[PDB]
Design a protein around this nucleic acid. Structure first.
Lengths: 378, 49, 100, 63, 135
RNA sequence: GACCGCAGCAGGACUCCGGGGUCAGCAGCCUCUAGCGCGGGAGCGAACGCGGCUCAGGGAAGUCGGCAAGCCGGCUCCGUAACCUCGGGAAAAGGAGUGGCUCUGACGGCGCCGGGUCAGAACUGGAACGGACGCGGGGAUCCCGACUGUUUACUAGAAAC
RNA sequence: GAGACCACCCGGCGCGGCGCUCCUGUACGGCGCAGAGCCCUGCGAUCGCCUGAGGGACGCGCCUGCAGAGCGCGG
């Protein structure tokens, strides 16, 4: 016969295969366009996800339902450990895509960065970079190699060690995320910006301007081998069914005598590397500021660490960055943020008027701990 | 070689409920779950009467 | 050497089916003692077996104070544990007493 | 910020939290949380329950 | 057109086969839903109506004889399932209800009984003017 | 507890005696007595089954059909149709209460003793009561057979007999 | 933070305690000159006070007490 009534093939096929992501954590794959002559800026940063909020904001959107009306929106806080440039990487435009030329590391690789090379640190040789450290640190090998990168390679990138100790993650092994100088006036200008930053701390406030839209790329949360009913969204077959209701009735027609690639079947329902796009950054601020989350409406100091603590996360010691929207991935998960590729043309101006600091753990009626001691008094 | 006791079950709790029932404490319409004829035979009041 | 520790049975039977709560607890009190005592044999006094099973087979006492005295040498190292009676656990933690 | 009070618990409800409900008599009652609401469906008197501010006022702990 | 304006989607609670109450003084005691206007149905999807969605309803035997045996456009004023307006307030109406409105929006009878939700008012003005209270 | 089913097989085999407690009960649910821990054990709590539990809003729109679930139920007390072979229907339908305490009245023997049954009240329980258990969903008609009964053991329990 | 076994992300883990915060709704007990009433000179369901108590926790800050990194196996 035929399909009779017409439906749709559930599940976007572009994301297939749905498998445990091989890459250790989110990978850039594509970096923002160069646009020679632009302000010299860095494209990306790496953070670790934290608990969600409930920020209230004012929408100045001409010809809109909520124009000039108070509304509340949901944002996910991301701790931003300040990164340090650990090396400069060059890429040459080549017939086979991008081929790399003369990567140079810093005179001293950072101690967390050294931990990355070895599977265990204490019980290991620790011999990596022994020749290199002696080779450099006299500021001669570094200069000539940087000169080679400038002469024979157009695209320049900053290898950056992120510091895991500042945040509550027990990682203790620095992760390396490549960032790309973009908008440099000519090839030479980009390399000189990187060298100044060699072995130097960069915080997210430098990388991402407030109110811009950025992309969140992370290994998403998973639930294990799942049945077709959740893995692919197939409708449950009628209750009265031998061998169980939850399963696709027919995996192929007789003549295409095989299982087709699109046919729905059970698979690992998670851990896919996924990127969302054009998500605005509502507040970029140092967590150290006692009033980092205060507002004119607040009338109290108000700090980012929420009452009772961020659930399944630590104390967000520095540089909290909130992205409006829910970024992919569970709490405590590496999430690479990059300047967005295709930002939404019309953006509501960001005017946060209150940020909820009430206990995420439990239903909390107390924005600050002090008001809670006041409510219970003696 | 030893012989232990019957380990007789408590009849203390039952004692109290039966004494209170003598005063009528547990005779509420909800507690009875049996027909009025079974609780007191309707023939029985007549045989005595 | 005697180590007295508080063993959260409730934080151990969680993650296992209720019908087999009490057997899992006895075994758990045997795994934990080995790590603390650094021994390879755990012998449980019959009195501990009474205590853990006192509530029933589905739910057990939340915590049992255990006195772990290592009584083994000559490479036998049997560690004996006897339940200690306490009113309640406030500032209670491993409290090693004595030496070889 | 803007804080209302529950129609049962009488605990300040911060913005974005709570279920607001409209009765048959055209009056809005803002329930605090699921707990303020579920105890109100069966109208267990707020005075009888000790967690509501209203009982604390009656018992005079609030004064 | 008759329903005029833009409504942010609010959670939709009443599907087809629902006898919503009727608060109009037109005398329709109860309305049974048949369809919701502008519903593109996905396979096996019952069409559903939110607060302020024009729905076609049929008056039951309880209602006045003239309006019976006919499809009449109505606008739902109250939905029991809680709906979140963009303010972030979550609001739930006590009992599901509807008002019979013309394609133009003129009600069958003048009075609207009890509370009327704010989304019904923006889409349909006559209800807004006669509302005893706009909650 | 060894019989008969190729066997130390969730199967079929006739009786005797049958404690307490809630309860109308030889019921269900616990328990003395009396037995006894079964073709083994440990991890792990994925899919998917199999045996339950719950679900916002609406509810049969699902489907061949309310299949299956669910609703109801015990007790007391009112209230109980059309029809009708007046015998029924009828538990029609439809409501109200039910808990624990503090007590007061009716009945066999004062010279002390019978027996807990029923009523009647107060006072109190997050606005809860058959709180587990046992335990009707209801009405409107139509078609066949009157029904209690019997049936094709291992696919038809009926309108068939 | 990942899980059928695996693999993966990580690692001197963790076990107890201490705080915070949350969940639940005033804990046991003591006291009363509260209590319908019966009544010996006491019984009483509850009620109030102590007690936004007590109990609990998988989230969170520590941790003073134990502890925790092979004199395995490969290389």
């Amino acid at each position: 016969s035929h399909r009779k009534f017409s439906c749709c093939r559930k599940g976007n096929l572009g994301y297939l295969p749905r498998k445990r992501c091989t890459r250790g954590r989110g990978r850039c794959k594509t970096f923002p366009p160069d646009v020679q002559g632009a302000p010299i800026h860095l494209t990306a940063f790496l953070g670790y996800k934290a608990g969600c909020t409930h920020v209230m904001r004012f929408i100045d959107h001409r010809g809109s339902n909520l124009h000039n009306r108070q509304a509340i929106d949901q944002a996910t806080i991301i701790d931003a450990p300040p990164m340090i440039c650990t090396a400069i990487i060059g890429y040459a435009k080549t017939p086979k895509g991008l081929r790399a030329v003369t990567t140079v590391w810093a005179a001293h690789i950072a101690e967390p960065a050294m931990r990355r090379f070895y599977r265990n640190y204490f019980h290991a040789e620790k011999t990596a970079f022994s020749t290199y450290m002696k080779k450099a640190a006299d500021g001669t090998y570094i200069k000539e190699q940087l000169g080679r990168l400038k002469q024979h390679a157009d695209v320049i990138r900053i290898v950056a060690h992120t510091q895991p100790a500042l945040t509550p993650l027990k990682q203790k092994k620095a992760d390396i995320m490549e960032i790309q100088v973009n908008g440099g006036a000519n090839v030479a200008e980009k390399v000189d910006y990187a060298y100044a930053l060699m072995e130097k701390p960069i915080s997210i406030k430098d990388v991402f301007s407030v109110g811009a839209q950025i992309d969140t790329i992370s290994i998403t949360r998973g639930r294990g081998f799942e049945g077709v009913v959740t893995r692919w969204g197939v409708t449950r077959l009628p209750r009265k069914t031998r061998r169980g209701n939850r399963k696709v009735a027919c995996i192929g027609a007789w003549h295409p005598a095989n299982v087709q690639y699109t046919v729905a079947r059970a698979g690992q329902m998670g851990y896919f590397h996924r990127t969302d796009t054009n998500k605005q950054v509502f507040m970029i601020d140092t967590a150290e500021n006692p009033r980092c989350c205060t507002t004119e409406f607040d009338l109290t100091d108000k700090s980012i660490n929420p009452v009772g603590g961020f659930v399944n996360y630590g104390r967000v010691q520095g540089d909290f960055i909130m992205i409006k929207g829910t970024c992919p991935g569970p709490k405590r998960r590496p999430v690479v943020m990059r300047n967005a590729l295709l930002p939404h043309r019309n953006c509501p101006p960001v005017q946060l008027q209150w940020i909820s600091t009430a206990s995420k753990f439990g239903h909390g009626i107390f924005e600050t701990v002090e008001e809670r001691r006041q409510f219970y008094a003696k | 070689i030893a012989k232990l006791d019957i380990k007789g079950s408590s009849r203390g709790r039952i004692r109290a409920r039966h004494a209170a029932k003598r005063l009528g404490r547990h005779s509420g319409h909800g507690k009875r779950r049996g027909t009025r004829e079974a609780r007191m035979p309707s023939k029985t009041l007549w045989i005595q009467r | 050497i005697v180590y007295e520790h508080t063993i959260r049975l409730n934080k151990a039977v969680r993650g296992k089916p209720s019908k087999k709560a009490a057997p899992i607890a006895i075994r758990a009190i045997r795994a934990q003692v080995e790590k603390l005592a650094k021994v390879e044999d755990v012998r449980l006094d019959p009195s501990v077996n009474v205590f853990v099973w006192s509530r029933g087979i589905r739910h057990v006492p939340r915590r049992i104070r255990l006195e772990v005295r290592l009584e083994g040498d000559d490479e036998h190292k049997f560690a004996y544990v006897i339940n200690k009676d306490v009113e309640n656990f406030k500032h209670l933690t491993t409290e090693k007493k004595g030496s070889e | 910020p803007r804080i209302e009070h529950c129609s049962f618990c009488s605990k300040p409800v911060y913005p974005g939290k709570g279920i607001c409900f409209v009765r048959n008599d055209s009056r809005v009652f803002r329930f605090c949380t699921s707990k303020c609401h579920r105890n109100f469906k069966m109208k267990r008197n707020p005075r009888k329950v000790r967690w509501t501010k209203t009982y604390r006022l009656l018992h005079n702990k609030d004064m | 057109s008759g329903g005029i304006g833009n409504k942010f989607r609010i959670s939709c609670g009443l599907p087809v086969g629902a006898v919503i109450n009727c608060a109009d003084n037109s005398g329709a005691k109860s309305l049974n839903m048949i369809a919701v206007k502008n519903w593109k149905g996905h396979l096996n999807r019952f069409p559903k109506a939110s607060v302020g969605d024009m729905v076609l309803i049929t008056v039951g035997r309880d209602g006045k004889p003239e309006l019976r045996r006919k499809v009449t456009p109505a606008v739902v004023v109250r939905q029991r399932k809680v709906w979140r307006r963009k303010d972030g307030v979550w609001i739930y109406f006590q009992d599901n209800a509807g008002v019979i409105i013309n394609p133009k929006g003129e009600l069958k009878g003048s009075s609207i009984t009890g509370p009327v939700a704010k989304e019904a008012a923006d889409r349909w003005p006559k209800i807004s003017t006669t509302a005893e209270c706009v909650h």
